[PDB]
Scaffold this active site. Structure first.
Site, PDB file in Angstrom:
ATOM      1  N   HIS A  83       0.867  -1.181   0.000  1.00 38.51           N
ATOM      2  CA  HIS A  83       0.000   0.000   0.000  1.00 38.51           C
ATOM      3  C   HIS A  83       0.907   1.235   0.000  1.00 38.51           C
ATOM      4  O   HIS A  83       2.132   1.119  -0.136  1.00 38.51           O
ATOM      5  CB  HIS A  83      -1.034  -0.012   1.141  1.00 38.51           C
ATOM      6  CG  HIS A  83      -0.474   0.059   2.529  1.00 38.51           C
ATOM      7  ND1 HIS A  83      -0.023  -1.048   3.214  1.00 38.51           N
ATOM      8  CD2 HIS A  83      -0.340   1.105   3.383  1.00 38.51           C
ATOM      9  CE1 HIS A  83       0.372  -0.686   4.422  1.00 38.51           C
ATOM     10  NE2 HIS A  83       0.190   0.612   4.549  1.00 38.51           N
ATOM     11  N   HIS A  85       1.660   3.755   2.197  1.00 33.40           N
ATOM     12  CA  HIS A  85       2.304   4.360   3.349  1.00 33.40           C
ATOM     13  C   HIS A  85       3.826   4.168   3.290  1.00 33.40           C
ATOM     14  O   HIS A  85       4.346   3.344   2.538  1.00 33.40           O
ATOM     15  CB  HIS A  85       1.767   3.758   4.649  1.00 33.40           C
ATOM     16  CG  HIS A  85       0.374   4.176   5.001  1.00 33.40           C
ATOM     17  ND1 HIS A  85      -0.426   3.427   5.839  1.00 33.40           N
ATOM     18  CD2 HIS A  85      -0.344   5.276   4.676  1.00 33.40           C
ATOM     19  CE1 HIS A  85      -1.586   4.042   5.998  1.00 33.40           C
ATOM     20  NE2 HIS A  85      -1.560   5.165   5.304  1.00 33.40           N
ATOM     21  N   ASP A  87       6.002   2.804   5.307  1.00 33.04           N
ATOM     22  CA  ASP A  87       6.601   1.496   5.594  1.00 33.04           C
ATOM     23  C   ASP A  87       6.496   0.528   4.423  1.00 33.04           C
ATOM     24  O   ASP A  87       6.992  -0.608   4.524  1.00 33.04           O
ATOM     25  CB  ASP A  87       6.016   0.859   6.862  1.00 33.04           C
ATOM     26  CG  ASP A  87       4.497   0.808   6.903  1.00 33.04           C
ATOM     27  OD1 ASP A  87       3.810   1.534   6.153  1.00 33.04           O
ATOM     28  OD2 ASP A  87       3.985   0.031   7.753  1.00 33.04           O
ATOM     29  N   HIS A 148      -6.928  -1.807   6.534  1.00 31.28           N
ATOM     30  CA  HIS A 148      -5.970  -0.819   7.018  1.00 31.28           C
ATOM     31  C   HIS A 148      -5.903   0.396   6.096  1.00 31.28           C
ATOM     32  O   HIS A 148      -5.804   1.543   6.553  1.00 31.28           O
ATOM     33  CB  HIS A 148      -4.601  -1.488   7.133  1.00 31.28           C
ATOM     34  CG  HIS A 148      -3.475  -0.537   7.354  1.00 31.28           C
ATOM     35  ND1 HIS A 148      -3.132  -0.072   8.604  1.00 31.28           N
ATOM     36  CD2 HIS A 148      -2.606   0.028   6.487  1.00 31.28           C
ATOM     37  CE1 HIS A 148      -2.100   0.745   8.494  1.00 31.28           C
ATOM     38  NE2 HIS A 148      -1.761   0.814   7.222  1.00 31.28           N
ATOM     39  N   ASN A 179      -3.309   3.889  15.224  1.00 30.17           N
ATOM     40  CA  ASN A 179      -3.639   4.867  14.199  1.00 30.17           C
ATOM     41  C   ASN A 179      -4.222   4.171  12.971  1.00 30.17           C
ATOM     42  O   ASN A 179      -3.598   3.275  12.392  1.00 30.17           O
ATOM     43  CB  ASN A 179      -2.411   5.686  13.804  1.00 30.17           C
ATOM     44  CG  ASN A 179      -2.741   6.737  12.766  1.00 30.17           C
ATOM     45  OD1 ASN A 179      -2.977   6.415  11.591  1.00 30.17           O
ATOM     46  ND2 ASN A 179      -2.786   7.998  13.190  1.00 30.17           N
TER      47      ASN A 179
HETATM   48  N1  LIG Z   1       4.404   2.569   9.748  1.00 31.96           N
HETATM   49  C1  LIG Z   1       3.517   2.070  10.758  1.00 31.96           C
HETATM   50  N2  LIG Z   1       2.407   1.391  10.514  1.00 31.96           N
HETATM   51  C2  LIG Z   1       1.696   0.989  11.599  1.00 31.96           C
HETATM   52  C3  LIG Z   1       0.408   0.195  11.354  1.00 31.96           C
HETATM   53  O1  LIG Z   1      -0.486   0.102  12.234  1.00 31.96           O
HETATM   54  O2  LIG Z   1       0.240  -0.385  10.241  1.00 31.96           O
HETATM   55  C4  LIG Z   1       2.262   1.372  12.856  1.00 31.96           C
HETATM   56  C5  LIG Z   1       1.800   1.057  14.288  1.00 31.96           C
HETATM   57  C6  LIG Z   1       2.313  -0.383  14.481  1.00 31.96           C
HETATM   58  C7  LIG Z   1       2.440  -1.023  15.881  1.00 31.96           C
HETATM   59  C8  LIG Z   1       1.626  -0.681  16.962  1.00 31.96           C
HETATM   60  C9  LIG Z   1       1.805  -1.323  18.194  1.00 31.96           C
HETATM   61  C10 LIG Z   1       2.772  -2.312  18.362  1.00 31.96           C
HETATM   62  C11 LIG Z   1       3.579  -2.653  17.288  1.00 31.96           C
HETATM   63  C12 LIG Z   1       3.404  -2.023  16.057  1.00 31.96           C
HETATM   64  S1  LIG Z   1       3.678   2.231  12.447  1.00 31.96           S
HETATM   65 ZN   LIG Z   2      -0.075   1.557   6.447  1.00 33.76          ZN
HETATM   66 ZN   LIG Z   3       2.060  -0.170   8.753  1.00 36.09          ZN
END
Ligand SMILES: Nc1nc(C(=O)O)c(CCc2ccccc2)s1
Ligand SMILES: [Zn+2]
Ligand SMILES: [Zn+2]
Length: 231
Positions: A83, A85, A87, A148, A179
């Site tokens: 996707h 984002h 990451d 997501h 989030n």
């Molecule tokens: N680039 C990022 N995506 C996400 C996502 O949710 O896809 C993040 C939060 C991930 C997370 C939260 C709690 C514990 C471990 C990991 S950060």
């Molecule tokens: Zn994402």
């Molecule tokens: Zn992510």
């Protein structure tokens, strides 16, 4: 043992062998004042490697290529971002500069452009509708519908029954949604149901962030998602 967030300094990347010719890559990055781990996939593609997702940023993605060259030693020739984002596409410019042909769905490329993120070069056809699957070398790409994000893909490695869920699948230990600014909370359970329906044989399930599991991660994510939806 699978590497954990505290074991990976930001800027370093680990590889983890899941099966013959199948690895996850694990990196770490800051978001909103905390550091999180992030998973992608590496799959042997004949004499080449197919990469699934960047290592969440240009520096991590450069370290990823170096670690692949060190540990596996075959050329990364194609990459798929699952996707829009950071990451998933953050580092695409490094990949392209390194010689890697970068791919995403037309929707991902568009959402990345709108967001001001890096944009994979090539568009993946045949994934525009919920439930669509296409073959891409040694993997199947699958669009389960919005979750997501509206564009999120999952990836299946038939040779090893490895399902990479990306960020639509949460690790077992994760119990809050966090989030979900770009999520479709209403569609997300339905989308996970399509994944379950289409890959009932998956033996290893890799979430976008955290420890791998089995098909139990799908129901777990649905529980988390509606909880955040239920109050
Ligand atoms: N680039 C990022 N995506 C996400 C996502 O949710 O896809 C993040 C939060 C991930 C997370 C939260 C709690 C514990 C471990 C990991 S950060
Ligand atoms: Zn994402
Ligand atoms: Zn992510």
């Amino acid at each position: 043992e699978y590497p954990t967030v505290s074991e990976i300094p930001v800027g370093e990347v680990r590889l983890y062998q899941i099966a013959d010719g199948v690895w996850s890559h694990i990196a770490t990055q800051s978001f909103d004042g905390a550091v999180y781990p992030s998973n992608g996939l590496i799959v042997r593609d004949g004499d080449e490697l197919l990469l699934i997702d960047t290592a969440w940023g240009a520096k991590n993605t450069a370290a990823l290529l170096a670690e692949i060259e060190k540990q596996i030693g075959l050329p990364v020739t194609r990459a798929v971002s699952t996707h829009f984002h950071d990451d998933r596409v953050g580092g695409v410019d490094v990949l392209r500069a390194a010689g890697v042909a970068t791919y995403a769905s037309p929707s991902t490329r568009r959402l990345a452009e709108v967001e001001g993120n890096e944009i994979p070069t090539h568009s993946l056809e045949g994934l525009s509708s919920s439930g669509d699957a296409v073959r891409f070398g040694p993997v199947e790409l699958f669009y389960p519908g919005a979750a997501h994000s509206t564009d999120n893909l999952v990836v299946y490695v038939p040779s090893a029954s490895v399902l990479y869920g990306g960020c639509a699948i949460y690790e077992l230990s994760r119990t809050s949604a966090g989030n979900v600014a770009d999520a479709d909370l209403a569609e997300w359970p339905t989308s996970i149901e399509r994944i379950q329906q289409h890959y009932p044989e998956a033996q290893f399930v890799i979430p976008g962030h955290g420890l791998p599991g089995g098909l139990d991660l799908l129901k777990h994510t649905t529980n988390v998602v509606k909880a955040h939806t239920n109050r």
